[PDB]
């Protein structure tokens, strides 16, 4: 009888990117699907580049929003892990092939035919809308369990910003006691990496062009040192230190000062994007074995592992909590980083007030 | 009473690097030192780039060779590990600290304060003299042993071209069998990455832009396939198919195409030295957690086990033997590639030849 349900979200209708409500159709639940109330999404600087259409490939209308949090209202038929009432999250992905190297080792992430959040099309032929809505829908094994222990608020950022940088913290070996990681960038990704290098105990320095960013690093965050990138001494002092950096900026930057410092065998993780190739010197990455990688989000295991480790060491993003109706406001200050350090929206409690008209009650009397 | 001892090789004067005949002291044997007559020496491009003040910091008279292969004359006191009438080999270091966490992981390469071969002074200030020459003397400690097993001609090339390669094939995993590695640049380095490749059981494809190298690579080298870079289907074809790649080229060439290669997670390893930087597009490296890594030569035990490895396992570099008086020649051809694929210079054989006066016999009658 119902094979799809009326869902509404704020998406764009044009490259100004501006949000308004905008009622569409979801999937029924499938056999293996959940669908949730959604009650937080983060706001991740991939939403505004998407609405914007930053990438000259986005479909409009575009309906943002890959940090969702919410409770599981519906489980299909032979769903098991999940039931009715459950806290659960969705990323960056929705969708993989489940029958390729990467899938069948916990990447799918890494699937050549991943399906994204938004972005792209379901297997269905229709549109991917995000996490800026009521109501969600997905495959069983797209979703996560979020503990208990784990303020729904501020759980939604480890959904993308979160596992972005735990993800390479991990497959690069700068999880263990002791090590030295830097952090480029504190922004979102910067401050989750901070955090979860923190929670690793691991020491962790913030490399920054900033002054400002000083007292957000060690009075904020708690890290363990500061360099301001622009001062020479402070950069010569802190040469083959590190032994490996997240490095999270989506700007052009100079690399050699980063491979500097590196200790030998260091490591310089790439999770931001830069518009443009950067210059890459050979030789010191031979004379000190050094290398320059990149990684992205991370595959739904290790999404689960995540969130079980955040709400056990007590890991909790630093979160700005806004209402729906705030949101092209919120987009405002994104795209200057005026945040510390990621929005969330209160899905739950603001997003129906802000669907509610504002006519004001009257008689007509002229006619 | 002997502090120090006489000498010979062929040495340059100037930048020409016009090699000839030179006399010179070496240290006498130490307490831990081992003096070897040299009987082999092979022929390195870094020879070439020595002599010719390539860098611009070359100590004339340069007396370079570092693939040193000989027969032990006189032990230290205190040595144990060696004995008179052994087979040794040197390399590319003669020196390192001892007491930093590079020494003490097996890695003297990586020493801060690593001594090398030649370009260098030793301890006692004199400066360091290579394998062009009659004897040598080394501390213990950066000498191998050379395995009855192993032809002691051809084994010179692991010293330097060896270890270059085989060293990075095990620190990033790059020697299981199964695996698909490819190699760039088919000259000393890359004909030696085949061949241990091919000895850890992967398959390795040869990667260059020259017809001609296809008959080398498959005829001559055993290699298991062949891409010829310049042909946009059969790089097409090979689109995320390596594990890793091994580059040997020390010259500008296009680094996306290498990275399109690689499957996910896969790692290009550079261990030769463009002039110029590299453009490094970032977008790739994250979309399928790819790195691109440097690496050189290799730690005295990682010797010795790559030694140990060739003699077992029948890995012989491809050399042309030849005699000390031609070794101008020698670095005419090197500097062209017109060698398949290494110069070894019969130092035992053909040395003291070199040196023996063409001085015709004669009365002087003409007064
Ligand atoms: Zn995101
Ligand atoms: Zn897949
Ligand atoms: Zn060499
Ligand atoms: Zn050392």
């Given at each position: 009888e119902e094979h799809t349900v009326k869902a509404v979200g704020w998406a764009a209708r044009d490259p100004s990117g501006h949000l308004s409500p905008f009622t569409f159709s979801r999937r029924a639940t499938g056999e293996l699907d959940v669908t949730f109330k959604v009650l937080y999404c983060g706001i991740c600087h991939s939403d505004l580049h998407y609405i914007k259409n930053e990438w000259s490939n986005t479909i409009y209308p575009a309906l943002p929003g890959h940090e969702i949090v919410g409770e599981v209202t519906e489980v299909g038929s032979?769903?098991?892990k999940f039931k009715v009432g459950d806290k659960v999250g969705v990323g960056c992905i929705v969708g993989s092939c489940h029958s390729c190297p990467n899938c069948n080792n916990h990447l799918e992430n890494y699937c050549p035919n991943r399906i994204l959040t938004f972005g792209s099309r379901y297997y269905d032929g229709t549109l991917n809308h995000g996490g800026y809505s009521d109501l969600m829908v997905v495959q069983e094994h797209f979703a996560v369990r979020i503990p208990?222990?784990?303020?729904?608020d501020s759980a939604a950022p480890l959904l993308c910003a979160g596992i972005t940088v735990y993800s390479p913290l991990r497959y690069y070996g700068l999880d263990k006691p002791g090590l030295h990681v830097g952090v480029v960038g504190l922004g979102g990704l910067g401050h989750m990496a901070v955090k979860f290098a923190k929670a690793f105990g691991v020491k962790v320095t913030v490399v920054s062009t900033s002054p400002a960013k000083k007292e957000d690093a060690?009075?904020?965050?708690?890290?363990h040192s500061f360099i301001l990138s622009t001062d020479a001494e402070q950069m010569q002092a802190a040469?083959?230190?590190?032994?490996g950096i997240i490095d999270t900026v989506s700007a052009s930057h100079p690399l050699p000062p980063l491979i500097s410092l590196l200790k030998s065998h260091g490591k310089l993780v790439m999770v931001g994007d830069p518009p443009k190739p950067l210059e890459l010197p050979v030789f010191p990455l031979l004379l000190g074995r050094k290398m320059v990688a990149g990684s992205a989000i991370g595959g739904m295991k290790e999404t689960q592992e995540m969130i079980d480790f955040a709400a056990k060491e007590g890991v909790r993003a630093d979160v700005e909590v806004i209402p729906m109706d705030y949101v092209n406001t919120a987009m405002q200050r994104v795209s200057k980083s005026d945040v510390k350090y990621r929005f969330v929206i209160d899905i739950g409690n603001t997003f129906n007030d802000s669907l509610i008209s504002s006519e004001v009650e009257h008689h007509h009397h002229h006619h």
């Open positions: 032979k769903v098991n208990d222990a784990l303020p729904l060690i009075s904020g965050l708690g890290a040469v083959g230190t590190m032994d």
